[PDB]
Design a binder for this molecule. Structure first.
Ligand SMILES: [Mg+2]
Lengths: 90, 435, 277, 294, 145, 151, 252, 194, 48, 48
């Protein structure tokens, strides 16, 4: 059985039962919300292509010290920043 | 103003004379009532003259530099979202609203409005003790204009919908790293905690990566013996619980998610994946390598990669940096070769690919480099573009695997014969020793 | 020879000096080859001229895809005419597939062009919707769509709604394709300089059965004598999109090629002297 | 509610699956909240109007707000002679055909809402798939500890689609700037000058000029460039959590993972059902090696 | 007889078959509620010749029409939009103070065109002198002054 | 020693800017607690608490005085329960758990009210949620306003 | 859904090309498939065919068409296994390792059925495990081993020489029923030819590579005269590193 | 009529999960009552009789819909006419193959076990509920183990399907149907098509 | 009230059983209108 | 509960009828009621 003390918890539920009339009860016609994959998409690029790919959108040498986003992490780097990596290595 | 309410005020056209001499054509439509123009189209109710005078008096200030009066300040100041200080949007704020608001704010406290503020202390109030009922909140906009006046929404077509939900069903396809997380991406844990750094967490992995892929001139090697527990996870009941919460964090961060090849979660109840390292062995005997990769590494033989690149490009052919980059990313860090590198390799290796292709029966897979199709992903060609058996392999693992083949020189930079003699006499078991 | 190039020569040369650009041209070519719509348009446009085997038309379609075929201007003109004829004689198929804008008699003002625009006439030749059209990438497809609709609705003539002027093969020239160096093989039908579209129209055997249509009367004769020119260029844009495509490819090639050769030689010699040193 | 929350969870989950980004609970709920309030607005305005259902002949009339509320009932004295039972059923059926008309209206409205919602999701969704690093493999390709295996069959049947121009980036923003370039080019032309004096022209300027909106008038007063939230390039909720407390980090990443898994399971169920409907799949497992042999 | 089965397909009237249409979900919920709703509407109204057609066919007692139409201005995403930038999204972004951002961007631009071509020759240099890398901008000092 | 705080999803710093303040300022009646409560993934008591704080912060920000009747309005059920409890057990304060009735309801106890709610209908949305639907008899109105000697 | 889709079928996207007729024929084939699956579940014995590590839905690259390999896998080998199961139940050999069946049935005429089936089962297995689809380049250590034996004063002469000796051994087995192995005697390498129904484990060698010289292996592709071409291709598709780790495990 | 139809609707729209255990036969509106629950289990004894043109009336209970789904036309073309015209019983196997329901069980007194299983359960959070219900379903009502196609009770067993589609599929009358039938009765015992 | 429909409730589960063995479980108008009550009062229960 | 995949299919049972879950005739799309999360943070607490 349900204790008298705990019944308040049901209130919001019971509340939006009452309030579900009209548009809130309405679902978009045709659309289930479950969208299955159909095609296969890969936008990956060779490194030399993405070296200057985002220069106009952002600054040049956008992928510079990025290890995950480049196959060559050290390209585009100016000498100093290249030296930094070894500097912390030794 | 796009709207039903957005019609203007009463405006003059002159006497009969000027009206007949103004209009050329006049077409009439049936009588309907007069809607009073809304508050923002009404010139006498909206006059901002005071505020515009304030803008103009401060206008020469707006033409000078911005300069911090703390010198050595660079980073911008953050303005957060929803703070009243920063709200620039006036939806219904007319001169009318700004004045109703002004007055309410003034009778709240006057001492906010004084150039030199006097003491502000609360006194009694004339409406009652409950006077706030008749006072509070912000001035309210008339509800007619709230409801009706809004712009006409630009109709969205079905075309753009179908495009959006196409993009919606593109992103719901699986990414190859998520089901079984590579040991390579699970070394990346960093916490701000004072107990996380003392124990190098991913140290054995990181050591492996360094030793295999990096020159010995530049590499930092973590030693487990000096690390807190011996670089290990302590036995169960011993560590006071340091070890247990260590294990909890690790097992929670390293767990996979999404659906596997059998169509189920890694944690699913009755059905299991990687039974007795059945996938581990499946990688053992297969290995990740292209046929094209080893044909190249066979024909090139000993001679310098860079030399080859200057050769295979006459002066006017292509940028050397480009095919150098693409070559490096293809050989180690195994990737699909760019159609640059594929064109070069095609006119370079043509006799080895011919010889590899010369015996094959009709219905069996050949080896071909033709980029006639736009995309490079070698799941797209049937794996027949390069010699690849895989759709995708994560770079780090590929590099470790092919470097476990001894062909290239990384720690062999030394003098040649000394390198080989160390390899022979110390064996590969020289690194059994951690000292 | 370093001067005269075909499209194939350009793509195989450029394949070395631009990875991404060629990758794009080729992806686009593929996607255009996949459309049933562009195919049906090409086919049903060029059928009357040959009048014959759909085998030859299909072949010419596939060859058109690669730049290996551009239509001769003569063939172009009589194809346009053939279109006006086939769309007028039975209106049902070609007003439900090829689109004309229809007059709104709900709106009436006084002008000689705008009245023939107002009642019972064909206002404009309508291009394919952005979903069924030539390829655009799916980054921008949404904004492309919005723009197309915003512009058609409010009667803005500009951007993706306006059709670029396409070139054809000159009457005296027997060449099959576009070339990088030769510009006189390609002929544009402009407003001012015309290719004899009028004199070919009036002297055609279809002139009177087309003169019958009250709706076409506005697109034949407009204050802008550019109604015929616009109808023409629009028609061959919506039917054969890839002529402009390749034309722009070669345009771009001839523009950017020599900077690229300079970069190539400079860098290669860089690693060259660096290497021998 | 359901259709929305499914798509939003799709987005959140995918956001963490493909890149290491987490969406803030705050954000996730505020999306849904915006859908909800949209529906609410449509309700507010829907109650100002009435729908009339009518039963037999015209002799039973029922006037009802589209939400299904009943305002008036008109009846022929013919009806008064029937039976209490049949009177009830008659009025009830009129009420039903009223609710029908209303519900047709509302369902168009809802389609409209769904479209606005999608349009609002688009900078996020197209935020995650429009990057130079994003990729997918076919769902039928085996996955092993190193990487993903190649699907063998029909080497023609696998086509990799690409959403991004591989040469220098052309972003949606450049397209909007192109659109206003063409707007100005059209306007400033002589033929455009004459067009701006037409009714079409002033309709265009009333709807799509924000710049001319008088101070204090509702709506945006500038034209906005399309939002750019590139997913791998923008740190969202994971960096704040990682700085503050690891525990909340682990919990939120766990939530995202769970949601993603759930979504994927749903997609598998729909796939299975569509496979059974067309008879390629049986109604109970007939192939157990596809499961037990891993 | 075939004509009789043709008759079966016609929708239910009350003139022929003397039965109201079924529509089921409304009957399921609201069947017991109807007395309530009706008396809330102040009872029915018995009028005369509602659906009864006149001599020449005109409606006697002209019928009630629905005002309902789909409201077209109601997008909520433009109602509550971003507090400073006017964008219509639901996306919460913490921006930077305008004028912080301007200054910031300016000094970056200066610093980077200082590092990458220091001599103003105009071409990008990835091997910059130690003086240009660790060197402070004189524009900062000039701004203080 | 103060460094960690539970529930990191909603930070006090981020709730300083109140949500949709540019709307419910201008017609606070069209904005019942429900519309805003869909914004937070928390339980009922917490989200109403937060809404109260939003209103107050907003008011102090706009330099006007806040509605002090608002906490009573959002919590109205809790208000009246406390009033009637105070009259029942004779005490002044807020009723706590120990003093609740020990009645055990059946499983389906809520059915009558459930079908009453599920079948309700409303002319406009204001009728749907007005603040005063909690009150029917005169006793209700006498308990709800006992505080303001004005009302 | 994987469990519900029958064994052969591929699960893909609807292109809506299906006329209702063939759409029904498909459902009927699926029903039949369910029935035959129910009977194969009960026909299941102790031993079973090995799961293939690489997708064979298309052929094995540079070596086999789809029909060739699937005539080995789904025709001859599965018959071998049905035989093996029929004759290892109701005998002292019930439920033991593949080994202890091969080894305890060695050299006896009475159990020749069990032994032949067993050894063929092993050979086919090891053959599948000896094929890596795009081939592989032989590892350094193995090359060093082979060179010390076969190599005469030439660079990896041992590779051309080993892939020669394998050809010769294959051509010198006339009956075209059997196997060719590269094996480790435990004191040296050699290329041995096993007749059908014989196995390297039975002779207590340690196998490195397997090549299938049955005529049924190369008939559909290379015809009856195509054995040389066949072997030459096999080396394009073989798996060396396996042979290597087996060699190194044998040594220690 | 209205109360039965509305009852069916009630079962269809039930907010919390309503599992209809079907033990024994169903006449028309009973068919409706059992099949439209979102969780509808069939035991071996379950049966569906959609008849009533035999009592001189048109079938009721909404199962008509199930018979007209494009799915049924795919799998068993003609079956719809067979069951609607001829009063004819469908069984568990037939209701499973048509995909009218997902769930089937052979266990004695299932109802007791459901009771006692949901006694041992603890929380009400929908995570918990989802798993408890789901685990119940997978362990019993889905046939993962110990089930075969020979063993499920089926009226339409595959030859019969072929016959039905030869007779009743795609025929534009009852009259066409029976001159077809009449022509089929006439076949010898020796014909290929018999 | 008619003892037509009977029930068995566990903590979290609910059993509704139709009892009319005489007429072969054919529901009357009253009994059906009753079942649509017991079904949704069992189904809209808190603990089921 | 969440880790064991089992029972997650049940959030989505509406998928069992394809042409319906598109049509939205029935208001119950979810396990406990109208949708999967109506009140996630409230309802379950009614159990002691
Ligand atoms: Mg009551």
């Amino acid at each position: 059985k349900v204790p008298h003390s705990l019944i308040y918890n049901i209130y919001p539920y019971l509340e939006e039962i009452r309030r579900r009339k009209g548009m809130m009860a309405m679902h978009p016609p045709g659309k289930d919300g479950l969208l299955m994959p159909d095609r296969v998409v890969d936008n990956r690029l060779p490194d030399h292509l993405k070296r200057g790919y985002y220069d106009d959108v952002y600054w040049k040498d956008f992928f510079a010290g990025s290890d995950e986003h480049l196959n060559e992490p050290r390209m585009g780097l100016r000498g100093d920043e290249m030296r930094r990596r070894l500097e912390e290595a030794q | 103003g796009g709207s039903v309410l957005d019609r203007s005020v009463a405006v003059p056209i002159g006497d009969s004379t000027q009206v007949r001499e103004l209009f050329v054509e006049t077409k009439v439509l049936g009588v309907e009532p007069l809607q009073s123009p809304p508050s923002w189209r009404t010139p006498f109710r909206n006059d901002f003259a005071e505020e515009r005078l304030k803008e103009l008096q401060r206008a020469p200030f707006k033409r000078e530099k911005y300069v911090s009066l703390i010198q050595g300040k660079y980073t911008p100041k953050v303005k957060k979202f929803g703070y009243t200080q920063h709200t620039t949007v006036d939806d219904f704020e007319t001169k009318e609203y700004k004045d109703r608001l002004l007055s309410k704010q003034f009778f709240q406290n006057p001492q906010a409005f004084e150039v030199v503020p006097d003491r502000h202390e609360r006194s009694v109030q004339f409406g009652g003790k409950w006077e706030y009922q008749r006072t509070h909140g912000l001035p309210t906009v008339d509800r007619n204009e709230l409801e009706n006046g809004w712009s006409e929404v630009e109709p969205i077509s079905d075309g753009e919908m179908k495009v959006i939900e196409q993009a919606l069903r593109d992103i719901s396809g699986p990414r190859p790293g998520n089901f079984v997380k590579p040991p390579s991406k699970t070394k990346s844990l960093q916490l701000s905690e004072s107990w996380w750094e003392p124990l190098g967490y991913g140290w054995e992995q990181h050591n492996e990566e360094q030793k295999a892929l990096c020159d010995v001139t530049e590499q930092r090697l973590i030693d487990g013996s000096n690390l807190p527990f011996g670089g290990k996870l302590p036995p169960f009941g011993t560590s006071y619980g340091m070890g247990e919460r260590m294990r909890a964090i690790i097992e929670d961060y390293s767990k996979g998610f999404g659906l596997g090849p059998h169509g189920h979660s890694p944690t699913h109840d009755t059905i299991h994946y990687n039974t007795l390292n059945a996938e581990g062995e499946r990688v053992r005997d297969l290995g990740y390598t292209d046929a094209l990769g080893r044909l190249f590494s066979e024909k090139l033989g000993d001679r310098d990669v860079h030399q080859w690149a200057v050769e295979s490009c006459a002066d006017g052919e292509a940028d050397v940096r480009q095919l150098l980059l693409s070559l490096h990313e293809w050989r180690e860090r195994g990737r699909p070769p760019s159609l640059l590198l594929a064109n070069v390799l095609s006119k370079y290796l043509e006799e080895e690919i011919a010889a590899f292709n010369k015996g094959i029966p009709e219905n069996a897979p050949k080896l071909q480099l033709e980029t006639s199709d736009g995309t490079l992903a070698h799941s797209g060609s049937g794996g027949s573009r390069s010699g690849t058996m895989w759709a995708d392999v994560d770079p780090t693992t590929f590099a470790l695997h092919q470097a476990s083949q001894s062909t290239r020189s990384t720690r062999c930079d030394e003098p040649f014969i000394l390198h080989l003699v160390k390899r022979a006499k110390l064996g590969e078991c020289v690194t059994n020793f951690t000292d | 020879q370093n001067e005269d190039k075909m499209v194939v020569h350009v793509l195989e040369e450029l394949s070395l000096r631009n990875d991404g650009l060629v990758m794009d041209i080729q992806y686009a070519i593929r996607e255009n080859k996949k459309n049933r719509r562009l195919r049906w348009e090409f086919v049903t446009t060029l059928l009357p001229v040959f009048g014959g085997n759909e085998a030859k038309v299909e072949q010419l379609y596939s060859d058109y895809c690669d730049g290996k075929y551009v239509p001769n201007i003569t063939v172009a003109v009589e194809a346009f005419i053939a279109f006006l004829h086939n769309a007028t004689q039975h209106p049902e198929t070609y007003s439900a597939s090829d689109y004309f804008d229809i007059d709104d008699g709900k709106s009436s003002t006084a002008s000689g062009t705008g009245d023939q625009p107002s009642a019972g006439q064909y206002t404009t030749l309508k291009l394919l919707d952005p979903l069924e059209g030539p390829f655009v990438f799916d980054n921008v497809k949404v904004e492309y769509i919005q723009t197309v609709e915003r512009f058609r609705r409010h009667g803005i003539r500009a951007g993706p709604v306006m059709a670029p002027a396409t070139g054809f093969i000159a009457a005296n020239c027997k060449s099959l394709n576009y070339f990088t160096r030769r510009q006189e093989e390609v002929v544009y039908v402009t407003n001012d300089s015309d290719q004899g579209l009028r004199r070919s129209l009036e002297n055609s055997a279809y002139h009177k059965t087309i003169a019958a249509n009250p709706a076409l009367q506005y697109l034949l004769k407009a204050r802008r004598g550019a109604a015929l020119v616009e109808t023409f260029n629009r028609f061959f844009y919506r039917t054969m999109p890839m002529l402009n495509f390749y034309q722009n490819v070669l345009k771009h090639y001839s523009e950017t090629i020599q900077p690229l050769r300079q970069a190539a030689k400079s860098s290669t010699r860089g690693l060259a002297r660096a290497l021998e040193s | 509610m359901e259709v929305y929350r499914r798509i939003t969870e799709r987005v959140r989950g995918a956001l963490w699956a493909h890149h290491g980004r987490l969406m803030s609970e705050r954000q996730f709920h505020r999306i849904l909240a915006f859908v909800y309030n949209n529906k609410y607005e449509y309700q507010i305005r829907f109650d100002r109007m009435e729908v009339v259902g009518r039963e037999w002949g015209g002799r039973v009339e029922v006037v009802t707000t589209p939400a299904g509320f009943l305002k008036r009932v008109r009846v022929n004295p013919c009806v008064e002679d029937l039976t209490l039972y049949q009177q009830q059923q008659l009025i009830l059926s009129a009420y039903a055909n009223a609710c029908a008309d209303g519900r047709k209206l509302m369902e168009q409205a809802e389609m409209n809402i769904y479209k606005q919602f999608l349009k609002d999701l688009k900078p996020i969704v197209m935020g995650i798939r429009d990057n130079p690093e994003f990729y997918t493999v076919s769902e039928n390709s085996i996955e092993t500890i190193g990487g993903v295996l190649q699907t063998g069959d029909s080497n023609n049947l696998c086509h990799t689609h690409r959403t991004i121009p591989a040469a220098k980036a052309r972003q949606p923003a450049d397209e909007v700037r192109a659109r206003q370039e063409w707007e100005q080019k059209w306007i400033n032309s002589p033929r455009g000058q004459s067009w701006a004096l037409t009714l079409r022209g002033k309709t265009y300027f009333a709807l799509h000029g924000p710049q001319y909106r008088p101070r204090g008038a509702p709506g945006a007063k500038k034209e906005t460039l399309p939002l750019d939230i590139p997913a791998p390039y923008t740190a969202m909720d994971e960096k704040r959590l990682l700085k503050k407390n690891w525990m909340a980090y682990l919990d939120n990443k766990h939530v995202a993972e769970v949601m993603w898994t759930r979504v994927k399971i749903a997609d598998r169920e729909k796939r299975q059902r569509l496979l059974q409907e067309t008879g390629r799949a049986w109604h109970r497992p007939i192939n157990e090696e596809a499961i037990n042999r891993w | 007889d075939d004509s009789d089965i043709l008759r079966l397909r016609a929708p239910l009237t009350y003139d022929m078959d003397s039965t109201a249409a079924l529509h089921v979900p409304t009957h399921c919920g609201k069947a017991s509620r109807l007395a309530g709703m009706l008396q809330d509407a102040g009872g029915v109204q018995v009028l005369d010749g509602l659906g009864e057609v006149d001599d020449k066919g005109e409606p006697k007692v002209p019928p009630l029409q629905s005002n309902a139409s789909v409201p077209t201005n109601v997008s909520f995403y433009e109602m509550a939009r971003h507090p400073w930038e006017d964008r219509a999204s639901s996306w919460r972004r913490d921006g930077f103070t305008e004028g912080s951002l301007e200054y910031f961007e300016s000094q970056y631009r200066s610093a980077e065109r200082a590092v990458y071509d220091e001599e103003g020759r105009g071409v990008r240099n990835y091997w910059p002198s130690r003086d240009a890398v660790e060197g402070i901008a004189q524009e900062e000092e000039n701004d203080a002054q | 020693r103060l460094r960690y705080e539970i529930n990191e999803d909603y930070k006090v710093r981020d709730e300083l800017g109140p949500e949709l303040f540019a709307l419910w300022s201008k017609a606070p009646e069209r904005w019942p607690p429900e519309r805003l409560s869909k914004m937070y993934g928390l339980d009922f008591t917490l989200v109403r608490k937060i809404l109260v704080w939003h209103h107050f912060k907003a008011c102090y920000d706009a330099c006007v005085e806040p509605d002090w009747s608002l906490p009573k309005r959002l919590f109205a059920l809790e208000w009246i329960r406390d009033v009637r409890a105070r009259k029942h057990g004779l005490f002044y304060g807020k009723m706590r758990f120990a003093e609740q009735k020990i009645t055990f309801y059946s499983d389906r106890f809520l059915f009558r009210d459930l079908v009453n709610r599920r079948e309700a209908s409303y002319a406009n949305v204001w009728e749907m949620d007005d603040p005063y639907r909690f009150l029917q008899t005169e006793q209700d109105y006498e308990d709800y306003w006992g505080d303001n000697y004005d009302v | 859904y994987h469990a519900y889709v029958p064994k052969g079928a591929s699960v893909q996207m609807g292109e809506t090309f299906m006329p209702s007729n063939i759409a029904t024929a498909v459902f009927r084939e699926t029903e039949a498939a369910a029935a035959r699956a129910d009977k194969t579940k009960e026909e299941t014995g102790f031993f079973s065919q090995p799961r293939l590590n690489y997708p064979v839905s298309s052929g094995i690259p540079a070596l086999f068409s789809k029909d060739q390999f699937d005539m080995q896998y789904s025709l001859f080998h599965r018959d071998v296994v049905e035989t093996l199961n029929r004759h290892t139940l109701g005998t002292p050999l019930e439920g033991h390792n593949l080994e202890t069946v091969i080894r305890k049935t060695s050299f006896d005429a009475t159990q020749a059925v069990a032994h032949t089936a067993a050894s063929e089962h092993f050979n086919y297995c090891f053959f599948y495990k000896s094929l890596r689809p795009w081939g592989t380049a032989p590892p350094p250590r193995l090359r060093e081993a082979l060179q010390l034996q076969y190599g005469t004063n030439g660079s990896a002469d041992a590779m051309d020489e080993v892939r020669r000796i394998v050809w010769v051994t294959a051509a010198s087995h006339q009956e075209r029923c059997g196997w060719v192995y590269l094996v480790w005697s435990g004191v040296h390498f050699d290329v041995v030819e096993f007749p059908h129904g014989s196995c390297p484990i039975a002779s207590d060698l340690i196998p490195l590579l397997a090549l299938n010289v049955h005529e049924s292996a190369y008939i559909l592709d290379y015809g009856t005269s195509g054995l040389k071409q066949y072997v030459e291709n096999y080396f394009k598709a073989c798996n060396w590193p396996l042979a290597e780790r087996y060699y190194l495990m044998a040594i220690g | 009529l209205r109360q039965h139809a509305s009852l069916i609707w009630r079962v269809y729209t039930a907010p919390r999960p309503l599992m209809t255990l079907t033990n024994g036969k169903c006449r028309g509106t009973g068919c409706g009552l059992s099949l439209f629950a979102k969780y509808c289990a069939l035991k071996d004894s379950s049966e569906f009789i959609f008849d009533g043109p035999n009592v001189g009336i048109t079938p009721y209970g909404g199962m008509t819909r199930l018979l007209a789904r494009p799915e049924t036309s795919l799998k068993y073309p003609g079956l719809a006419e067979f069951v609607v015209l001829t009063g004819a019983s469908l069984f568990a196997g037939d209701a499973l193959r048509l995909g009218w329901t997902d769930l089937f069980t052979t266990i004695p007194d299932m109802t007791y076990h459901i009771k006692e299983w949901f006694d041992t359960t603890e929380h009400m959070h929908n995570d918990a509920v989802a798993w408890q219900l789901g685990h119940l379903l997978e362990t019993c009502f889905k046939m993962k183990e110990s089930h075969s196609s020979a063993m499920e009770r089926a009226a339409i067993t595959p030859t019969r399907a072929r016959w039905v589609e030869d007779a009743f599929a795609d025929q534009p009358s009852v009259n066409d149907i029976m001159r077809t039938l009449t022509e089929i009765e006439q076949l010898p015992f020796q014909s290929t098509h018999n | 009230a008619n003892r037509t429909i009977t029930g068995n409730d566990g903590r979290f589960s609910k059993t509704i059983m139709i009892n009319e063995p005489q007429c072969n479980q054919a529901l009357s108008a009253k009994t059906a209108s009753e079942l649509s009550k017991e079904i949704d009062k069992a189904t809209n229960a808190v603990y089921s | 509960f969440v880790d064991l995949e089992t029972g997650t299919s049940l959030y989505f049972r509406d998928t069992r009828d394809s042409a319906e879950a598109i049509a939205h005739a029935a208001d119950s799309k979810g396990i406990k009621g109208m949708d999967n999360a109506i009140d996630l943070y409230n309802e379950y607490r009614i159990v002691p």
